[PDB]
C-alpha cells in the first residue's frame, strides 16, 4: 500500500545520480530530534533508494520522513517539488 513510500519514491527515482549521491549525504546534515540521528554511514553508498527509503522511511517512519525527505529536496534547491510531498497526505 504505501502512499508515502510511494510518493517519496516516485520522487526520489527523480533524483538524477548526483542529486541521489547528495540526497543520501545531505540527509546527515539537517538537524535530528532528540532520540533521533543521522543516517548511518555503511547506510549511505549501500542502500538503494528502495532500501534508502526503506531505511529512511524504517528509521524516521513514514510521517516524520516525508518531513525529513521533504527539507532535503528544499536544501537541494527543489521547492516547488518538495510541496509535491506534503501533498501525500
Known amino acids: ?7 517519496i519514491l516516485k520522487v526520489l527515482e527523480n533524483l538524477t545520480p ?22 548511518p554511514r555503511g547506510a549511505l553508498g549501500q542502500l538503494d533508494i528502495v532500501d ?3 531505511k529512511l522511511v524504517a528509521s524516521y517512519y513514514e510521517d ?3 518531513e525529513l525527505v521533504v527539507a532535503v529536496l528544499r536544501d537541494m534547491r527543489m521547492l516547488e517539488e518538495a510541496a509535491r510531498l506534503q501533498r501525500a497526505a
Open 18 to 39: 548526483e542529486e541521489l549521491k547528495k540526497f543520501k549525504m545531505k540527509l546527515g546534515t539537517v538537524p535530528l530530534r532528540e532520540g533521533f540521528e543521522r543516517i
Open 64 to 66: 516524520y520522513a516525508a
Open 1 to 7: 500500500m504505501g502512499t508515502k513510500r510511494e510518493a
Open 52 to 54: 534508502l527509503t526503506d
